[PDB]
Amino acid sequence: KSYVLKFLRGQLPEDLKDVNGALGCLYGTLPDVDEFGQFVISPDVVNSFHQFGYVKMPIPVLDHQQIDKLADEVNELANNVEHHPKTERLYATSLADLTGGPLFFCQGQWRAAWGMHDLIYLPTITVAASQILNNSLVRLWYDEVFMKAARTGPCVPWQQNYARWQHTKPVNHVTVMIALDTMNKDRGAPCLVPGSHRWREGGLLPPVSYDPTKDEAHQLNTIWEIINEEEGEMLMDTPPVTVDLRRGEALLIHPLTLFATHGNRSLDAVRCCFIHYMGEKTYAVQNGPLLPHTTKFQADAMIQGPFYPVVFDPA
Amino acid sequence: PSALHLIFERCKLNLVEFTAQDVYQICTTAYNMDTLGMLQDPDFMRGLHDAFRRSDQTVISPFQANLIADTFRKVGINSMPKEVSVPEEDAISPESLILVLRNMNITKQRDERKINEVLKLMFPILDEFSPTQLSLTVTELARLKSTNADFVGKLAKRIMEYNDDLSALDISSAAVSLAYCPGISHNILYRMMQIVEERMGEFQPEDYINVLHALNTLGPKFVNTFRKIVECGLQHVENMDAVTLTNYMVCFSTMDYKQREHIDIYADALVEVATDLSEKDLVMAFIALQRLRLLSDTMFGTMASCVIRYAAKMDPRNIAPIMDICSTVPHASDHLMKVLMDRAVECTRILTANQLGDILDILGLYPPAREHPLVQLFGKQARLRLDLMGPDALANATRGLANLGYADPEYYAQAAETGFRYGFKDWTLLEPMLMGLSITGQCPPTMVRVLGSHIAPMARSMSLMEIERANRYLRRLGCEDDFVYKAMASRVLQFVKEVTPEMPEDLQVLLQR
Amino acid sequence: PLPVSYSPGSVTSTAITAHCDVLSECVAKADELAVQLKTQEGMEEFVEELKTSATNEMTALVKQMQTTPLLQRAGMHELRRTLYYTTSLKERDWLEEKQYTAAMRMLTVEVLRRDGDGVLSADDVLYVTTHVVTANFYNRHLWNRMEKSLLKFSNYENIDMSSVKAFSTRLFKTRRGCAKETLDIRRKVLLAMSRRVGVLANDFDLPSLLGVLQCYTVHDLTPFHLEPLAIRATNHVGDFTPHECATLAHVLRKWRTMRLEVCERLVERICTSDQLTHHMANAAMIAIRTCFNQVSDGGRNAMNAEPTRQKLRAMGEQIGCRLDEVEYPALPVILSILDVVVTLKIYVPKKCLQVIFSQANDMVAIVMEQKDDPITAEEGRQLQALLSHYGNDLAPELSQRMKEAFREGVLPDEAS
Amino acid sequence: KVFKQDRILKQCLDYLVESNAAVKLSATSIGAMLNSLAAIRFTYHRSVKQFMIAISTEQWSEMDASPLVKIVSAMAKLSLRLPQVLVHVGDRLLDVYTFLSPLDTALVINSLQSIGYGNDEVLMMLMRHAASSARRWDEVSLTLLFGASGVHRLLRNVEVAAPLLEQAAGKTSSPHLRQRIAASLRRSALPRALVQSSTSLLTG
Amino acid sequence: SHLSARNIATEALQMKKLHQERGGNPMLAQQARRVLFATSIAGQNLDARSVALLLNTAVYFGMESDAKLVRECIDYCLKNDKLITVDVLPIVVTACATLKSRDAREVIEMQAQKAARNAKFLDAKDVTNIISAFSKTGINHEKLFAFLSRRVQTLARVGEFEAAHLVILANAFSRLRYRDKFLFGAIARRAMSLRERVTVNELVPLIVAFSKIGLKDPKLSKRFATKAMEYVDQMNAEQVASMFMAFAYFGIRYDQLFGVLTNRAVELIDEFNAQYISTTLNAFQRIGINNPELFDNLAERALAVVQDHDARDISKTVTALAHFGLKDEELFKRLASHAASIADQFDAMGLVNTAHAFARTNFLQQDMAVALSERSVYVCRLLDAGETRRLLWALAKFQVRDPKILTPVFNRCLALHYDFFADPTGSEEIEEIFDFYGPNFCPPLYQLYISRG
């Protein structure tokens, strides 16, 4: 180990993936090995997720005195006057053109900012994700955020998560979504079909078409293009339902579920976060990096490395 | 209720169009009564804060904006009002620049660039100021600590040329704010004090306070002025607000009045009225009385009864002077010392370096302090704070702990290591280190050599008695070198020109060595 | 058949070259109209026409680069020329802010991409940084990477002779009002390529030496590697005008080169002027004083101290007898000259004293009579004292004038 | 609508004084126009000053009290301290001070204190009038009076302050105002017994 | 519990001191991060000292220019430069060294221009702290350092400084590349006139700095050599390695001192770790002296402690072993295997030097080959002409021939082709590269190679 100068002995590495653990920010630190058994989720929630393809948590997982700090980090990550430091360590951001737009997103941001690094290891969601994945180990894949603009905030059409995850051999994932602010059907709350995860025996629906200028209603009524008569009858049986979220509520989804999110009609912005987990027994498909500037794997190599740290391990 | 729920939901989701006056009204009605839950719904306050931040603030007076920020900060969300820009060409006037400065001062955010700009723009239009506006801008500038003396001098000249168009309190404020600016020429100060002297007939009790404060800040150079005011005070000593008499005592202490005839009568009046003082004025009344040497038993009992009231919850920076004052008084006040020690025990973790050093110093020779727990616990903290202590605090703490008999061996080793990179300017700065190292008498030889090399140049100064202490400390520490002993021997020979049996054994052995 | 994206920085091109030729013709015609000036309404319509043809051309160019991928296929020289024009058309304000910001964003994105590709050469970093910081455009990553890439001195050993002159002239003439946070970067640009200047020291033209020394001095930089240049100035001093010689005196003093012999040879050129100017007089006086401080009485050469001091006083008199010909811009110049005269014991003719004191009186009248704008009270103290030492007859009115001015307290203290 | 478009209102306020129409206007109209201009924090103060100067002595001689208090309040909230108009207000207030309602006295006291008016005798007579109707004062008037800037100077005589001190304790209920008045009592010329007794009930 | 911001500032300063110079407890760092992540200064009203201390301690613990506390402090230091006296100038200047934003640059330049106006009106402690803090950042204000140089020269004629002042001044002046002979002469004069008060713990760093500055003088160098003789039995491993490094920098073959230091160091072989081994071998390579018996012991000890090597240690040890001829098969296999896992930590120097040293040694592992070859694309923009040529020769000996790896290297070689083809030390080194690749690979580079030059 080389000699570190006297006034540099407390700093941190450029990429926060190296600190094998959670910083002492936000919540104190990880609980002891025995103290991990209080975050468990009631089985009824598990059956509800199995049936409807999504489920909400009974209690919020964050407090306002932490959500305000997270929103401060999110606002800082969007500066177009002084670009946020550690920008080059992100997977991809909408500000790569130095102009941005009415939508702001960043992926793999836990490698760039404090606090949000500590969010990954929050027990109250990691243990729930472990329970959803049949009581096994969990692994972070990549985290991203969304911030809509003011009353001209665009929407996101219907989508299936696995449509972006062809590189994974099995369908063994889960997604946790955090609402950083109060959300509503007039502000950008999500709407998802309560049975789209049990269609075509797990098949993947054809990709949807969209136009970058039409109104939100037209982008919402393009679902009929994909479905057939059989799926149409279930659509009549199971109409789409929108869920409203307050500050700090969490929603668990399934990778095969159709989902979309309305636009922004309020007077300001709105923020939300998406975290995607794996279980064990997960292998790549092709030879190459799953994400830009990540570790390369073999055609049938198990997925593991520094960029995909373990979070929670039962027993 | 039902409609209330809908209104609350519409407010939280942030669709309502709120103007700054509406948020001010809602903040007021939540601040004063809050019968319905406003400060206990965090999302409502978050939405209101967002509405306030995004809304234009240019339509409200500074005080209401400060109230909005204050009521926001209570519930647990930070908030700062938006700053203001300097007015443009046509909007310039003597009234708008004063508004800019006033908003700067009220909201507790200051800036030098805007101050420089407004003081550059004020000069060409200086003739449009009303005679009651200059006495406002003068006390506004001196509240921003703007060290610019020529502009304030011009304002003072214009004010004094307009003497008859101001009230007494305006002159009071002008004097007190003027005395706070360092670079003023003294002739202007003389003329302002003369103007104050001319207007004794109209003064009020608060309005004496500013003149007394100005005289205290100025010093004895204006002594005759304080001679006149105190004379005018002779007709009201029967009833004054205790703060006024406290200021009289403070000015007496800082002026060096050589006429006890009035000091005595003022102090007798203060004796009975001092019971109404707060902490700060009580402490500085104590200091003022002690410096002019008037503390006797009759007033000491009353002031001990007055200070025991606060003794349980003293502010740490007001403890050391009280111990110092009670040190230099022969009367019996052991209980006040006991309670002050007990209070200072609790505040050990939050005490700074200098405060702990002085507290330990003042307890150098107190016998009841030889067994109180502060002999050890304080020292423990002295172990940690040692990396921040300056030479003065280090010397004071070492002197106090050595006089109390603190038996930690490595403490003085670290003290010597710390002091070796500081250097010493005098014998007093070095004596506690040797005294502490003398509690055991052994230490690594290299530091002994360094101490000898430091002592050698200092031999030329201390007198015959102190050389005895230096020899006693050196010989016990196993010193061996010679160019130190001969240096002390030369100074000893400078006084005594012959070896005689009168000198003690250490002088005898030094004279033959 | 490996793909390579390198192109020379000084050859193939795209239509960006044609657009840049159009813009060059436009600015050349603007300077041609300026030449026609050196009527006004006759050229004004053509000036408006040039502005319009610049604005429409910029709009077309930015739309072309925005809509279709042309940046990635563009060569390096087109990027350099486009950056130059995007700045120069804004300093000589012709462009609207939004267009300029968008064009700068696009150019910086492409430059960062090229740096990632690594095809950037040593000369291109110098050109880009010197033509970015001067226009004062803040991009954090570009600035940080250019700062880091200027620390490898060995790469900058092969810069062309015209390149150093162009960069130095560009970085020099914009110094008078530079923003603070850009100063440090400037110095790095001047230090990464100093060694090439040091080795080229034998090839620069005569006025270019003075220009380079001034450009290095204004940035508070006097590196030892450039010390030979000043030496050359001491050798070829016979070609400069008295103004340039006076500037060279101060430059030499700032370079520690100032010795007795160089000043002794220097004073003659200042003497040869038909009419003196205050810069030359001040430079001569300060140089004479410093070289009087140079000679040492308590030293190994105590044999010729006074024979040298008398000579120095001799020139001092020779320049003093002609001091009545010069205008004095401000009181501090008068104070400096009088201080040197007094502390050096140089006789001056009474006519020059009369002119100096009359000018000082006329200048000091304004501040006192206008009751504000400045002269410090100390300055008035020494001026009154100087006249009192030299006599009241120099200005029998300024005596009571300064006395009254001090009585009214119209001159505030320096620390006030 | 709180519509801040001062560059438009400047034209109207310039026209009002260009045509010499500022003198014949009814007093109530002036007391409404100026109060409205003190609602959006007008900026071009010089034009308002030239508007104020235009009105002559005849108008101030017999104005009703209700528009007069509006005018002085608009002047105070606009942060204006015109010298030669304050003397007009002061001597005109001599004849109509009895007709002032308690709310009007409460408004006038702090409106004059906030503009640096230093004619002590008129403020003392206003304080005497306010103490006369002490039983007739409600909470809002107490807030406007005791919350004035530098009210300590207006607590001078014993008989001009005690008559309203009780009512203050009985009626007002906001603790912050109670502590404000308790702190302000300590900087007056009232005796120690009365100050101690008043603070014995006031603080809370 | 909750406390005012000034108490927080005091405890933060003590926490920084304890972490810096009294053992690196990780718990203290974590607790300080927790306390400082949730504290703001806007509400309160404090003087410049507490705000500057908060900014300094926050920046020390790894807070970039994005957090709330840093911005809150920086705006204040922007708006109140007059409240920044000479007392708080060095604290803020040190605090802004790591930050490289716009406001940080402007604050630093404000302090720099203020410093070279109070040059004459300073004292010992302020001069020392100011010069060290300015040395920390990397400023290039020559006039400021000259103004401080005259002040230190004058202040040294009355003899106030202690050993620590001399150490700090020498280190700070050396690190800034200020080659003023008279200043260091006065420093040395004040050092040599302080009898028995320069302990070895304060003597060695002064020698290190005096070696690092690079002034050419054999007289004071010989004085240093003779003065260091009497303490040869007193140092530990670190000071021995530092002395080797410093005397290698001096560049004078003081054979007597080298011999006695060797006989001292051979006793302290056990206490040597990887860092001292690398430092000693690098110093011996730089000076150019062969000492076999010591080399075998150092090689065996490094074999015993392979796991502890960093990127710098490997880049030094492998280069020294390749240069000196002493080869150990097992040690080299372990080093290559270890560097396989640490392939990401190499900087511009380490990757190229390790690859070249491995290539010349004919010890070509394949895991190391792929791990080091893949990394070349990331760093290729930073290298120089000669380093790129050496890396290309190492890659040609590595036999990779993969366009994904090779494409940026050739672009960079074309970028610096003037220096690339004007290096006599390696004129034969391009022959093997161009033999291995062939004309069918890079037509422009081949055309330039065939051309005269």
PDB file of C-alpha atoms in Angstrom, chain E residues 83-183:
ATOM      1  CA  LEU E  83     -14.421  38.661   6.927  1.00  0.00           C
ATOM      2  CA  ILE E  84     -11.658  36.248   5.848  1.00  0.00           C
ATOM      3  CA  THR E  85      -8.605  37.488   7.743  1.00  0.00           C
ATOM      4  CA  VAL E  86      -5.105  36.006   7.643  1.00  0.00           C
ATOM      5  CA  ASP E  87      -6.139  33.628  10.439  1.00  0.00           C
ATOM      6  CA  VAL E  88      -8.771  31.757   8.403  1.00  0.00           C
ATOM      7  CA  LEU E  89      -7.118  32.099   4.978  1.00  0.00           C
ATOM      8  CA  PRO E  90      -5.097  28.830   5.139  1.00  0.00           C
ATOM      9  CA  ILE E  91      -8.055  26.778   6.404  1.00  0.00           C
ATOM     10  CA  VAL E  92     -10.298  27.754   3.489  1.00  0.00           C
ATOM     11  CA  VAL E  93      -7.428  27.489   0.997  1.00  0.00           C
ATOM     12  CA  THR E  94      -6.743  23.929   2.148  1.00  0.00           C
ATOM     13  CA  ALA E  95     -10.466  23.152   2.046  1.00  0.00           C
ATOM     14  CA  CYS E  96     -10.740  24.155  -1.631  1.00  0.00           C
ATOM     15  CA  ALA E  97      -7.811  22.049  -2.879  1.00  0.00           C
ATOM     16  CA  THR E  98      -9.759  18.927  -3.857  1.00  0.00           C
ATOM     17  CA  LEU E  99     -12.818  20.787  -5.160  1.00  0.00           C
ATOM     18  CA  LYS E 100     -12.493  21.915  -8.773  1.00  0.00           C
ATOM     19  CA  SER E 101     -15.803  23.669  -9.419  1.00  0.00           C
ATOM     20  CA  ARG E 102     -16.256  27.271 -10.565  1.00  0.00           C
ATOM     21  CA  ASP E 103     -16.823  28.810  -7.132  1.00  0.00           C
ATOM     22  CA  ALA E 104     -13.873  26.914  -5.654  1.00  0.00           C
ATOM     23  CA  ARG E 105     -11.558  28.270  -8.354  1.00  0.00           C
ATOM     24  CA  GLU E 106     -12.814  31.810  -7.809  1.00  0.00           C
ATOM     25  CA  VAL E 107     -12.413  31.570  -4.016  1.00  0.00           C
ATOM     26  CA  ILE E 108      -8.876  30.223  -4.411  1.00  0.00           C
ATOM     27  CA  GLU E 109      -7.900  33.044  -6.759  1.00  0.00           C
ATOM     28  CA  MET E 110      -9.413  35.622  -4.394  1.00  0.00           C
ATOM     29  CA  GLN E 111      -7.309  34.267  -1.527  1.00  0.00           C
ATOM     30  CA  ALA E 112      -4.200  34.148  -3.721  1.00  0.00           C
ATOM     31  CA  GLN E 113      -4.527  37.776  -4.787  1.00  0.00           C
ATOM     32  CA  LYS E 114      -5.187  38.811  -1.187  1.00  0.00           C
ATOM     33  CA  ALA E 115      -2.114  36.948   0.092  1.00  0.00           C
ATOM     34  CA  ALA E 116       0.419  38.871  -2.009  1.00  0.00           C
ATOM     35  CA  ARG E 117      -0.612  42.140  -0.399  1.00  0.00           C
ATOM     36  CA  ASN E 118      -0.146  41.301   3.306  1.00  0.00           C
ATOM     37  CA  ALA E 119       3.216  39.634   2.645  1.00  0.00           C
ATOM     38  CA  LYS E 120       5.191  42.106   4.752  1.00  0.00           C
ATOM     39  CA  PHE E 121       2.772  42.002   7.711  1.00  0.00           C
ATOM     40  CA  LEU E 122       2.888  38.313   8.690  1.00  0.00           C
ATOM     41  CA  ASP E 123       4.601  36.301  11.431  1.00  0.00           C
ATOM     42  CA  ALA E 124       6.041  32.805  11.814  1.00  0.00           C
ATOM     43  CA  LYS E 125       2.900  30.721  12.366  1.00  0.00           C
ATOM     44  CA  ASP E 126       0.854  32.464   9.677  1.00  0.00           C
ATOM     45  CA  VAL E 127       3.708  32.260   7.158  1.00  0.00           C
ATOM     46  CA  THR E 128       4.155  28.534   7.786  1.00  0.00           C
ATOM     47  CA  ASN E 129       0.457  27.683   7.572  1.00  0.00           C
ATOM     48  CA  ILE E 130      -0.132  29.893   4.523  1.00  0.00           C
ATOM     49  CA  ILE E 131       2.761  28.450   2.543  1.00  0.00           C
ATOM     50  CA  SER E 132       1.826  24.846   3.348  1.00  0.00           C
ATOM     51  CA  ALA E 133      -1.831  25.419   2.445  1.00  0.00           C
ATOM     52  CA  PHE E 134      -0.896  27.069  -0.848  1.00  0.00           C
ATOM     53  CA  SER E 135       1.457  24.183  -1.601  1.00  0.00           C
ATOM     54  CA  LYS E 136      -1.442  21.774  -1.084  1.00  0.00           C
ATOM     55  CA  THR E 137      -3.569  22.948  -4.023  1.00  0.00           C
ATOM     56  CA  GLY E 138      -1.300  23.371  -7.036  1.00  0.00           C
ATOM     57  CA  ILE E 139      -1.493  27.095  -7.708  1.00  0.00           C
ATOM     58  CA  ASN E 140       1.114  28.722  -9.973  1.00  0.00           C
ATOM     59  CA  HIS E 141       1.355  32.240  -8.495  1.00  0.00           C
ATOM     60  CA  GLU E 142       5.074  32.974  -8.752  1.00  0.00           C
ATOM     61  CA  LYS E 143       4.879  36.508  -7.352  1.00  0.00           C
ATOM     62  CA  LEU E 144       3.116  35.311  -4.193  1.00  0.00           C
ATOM     63  CA  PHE E 145       5.833  32.755  -3.486  1.00  0.00           C
ATOM     64  CA  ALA E 146       8.536  35.361  -4.119  1.00  0.00           C
ATOM     65  CA  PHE E 147       6.843  37.754  -1.681  1.00  0.00           C
ATOM     66  CA  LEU E 148       6.687  35.026   0.954  1.00  0.00           C
ATOM     67  CA  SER E 149      10.286  34.030   0.178  1.00  0.00           C
ATOM     68  CA  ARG E 150      11.629  37.466   1.045  1.00  0.00           C
ATOM     69  CA  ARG E 151       9.621  37.437   4.281  1.00  0.00           C
ATOM     70  CA  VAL E 152      10.951  34.033   5.346  1.00  0.00           C
ATOM     71  CA  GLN E 153      14.495  35.096   4.443  1.00  0.00           C
ATOM     72  CA  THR E 154      14.201  38.175   6.650  1.00  0.00           C
ATOM     73  CA  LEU E 155      12.480  36.321   9.497  1.00  0.00           C
ATOM     74  CA  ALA E 156      15.203  33.653   9.536  1.00  0.00           C
ATOM     75  CA  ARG E 157      17.916  36.154  10.498  1.00  0.00           C
ATOM     76  CA  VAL E 158      16.508  36.416  14.048  1.00  0.00           C
ATOM     77  CA  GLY E 159      16.179  32.690  14.735  1.00  0.00           C
ATOM     78  CA  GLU E 160      12.628  31.851  15.833  1.00  0.00           C
ATOM     79  CA  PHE E 161      11.640  28.668  13.994  1.00  0.00           C
ATOM     80  CA  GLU E 162      11.744  25.173  15.453  1.00  0.00           C
ATOM     81  CA  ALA E 163      12.380  21.901  13.636  1.00  0.00           C
ATOM     82  CA  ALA E 164       8.745  21.406  12.600  1.00  0.00           C
ATOM     83  CA  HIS E 165       8.663  24.837  10.959  1.00  0.00           C
ATOM     84  CA  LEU E 166      11.754  23.914   8.947  1.00  0.00           C
ATOM     85  CA  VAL E 167      10.274  20.555   7.920  1.00  0.00           C
ATOM     86  CA  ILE E 168       6.971  22.095   6.818  1.00  0.00           C
ATOM     87  CA  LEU E 169       8.655  24.943   4.946  1.00  0.00           C
ATOM     88  CA  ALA E 170      11.061  22.601   3.150  1.00  0.00           C
ATOM     89  CA  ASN E 171       8.304  20.168   2.151  1.00  0.00           C
ATOM     90  CA  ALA E 172       5.923  22.878   0.937  1.00  0.00           C
ATOM     91  CA  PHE E 173       8.585  24.774  -1.000  1.00  0.00           C
ATOM     92  CA  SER E 174       9.943  21.590  -2.589  1.00  0.00           C
ATOM     93  CA  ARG E 175       6.537  20.352  -3.735  1.00  0.00           C
ATOM     94  CA  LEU E 176       5.858  23.608  -5.620  1.00  0.00           C
ATOM     95  CA  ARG E 177       9.014  23.474  -7.809  1.00  0.00           C
ATOM     96  CA  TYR E 178      10.615  26.687  -6.540  1.00  0.00           C
ATOM     97  CA  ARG E 179      14.352  26.517  -7.278  1.00  0.00           C
ATOM     98  CA  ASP E 180      15.573  29.523  -5.291  1.00  0.00           C
ATOM     99  CA  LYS E 181      19.065  28.784  -3.994  1.00  0.00           C
ATOM    100  CA  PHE E 182      19.317  31.543  -1.378  1.00  0.00           C
ATOM    101  CA  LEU E 183      16.067  30.548   0.336  1.00  0.00           C
TER     102      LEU E 183
END
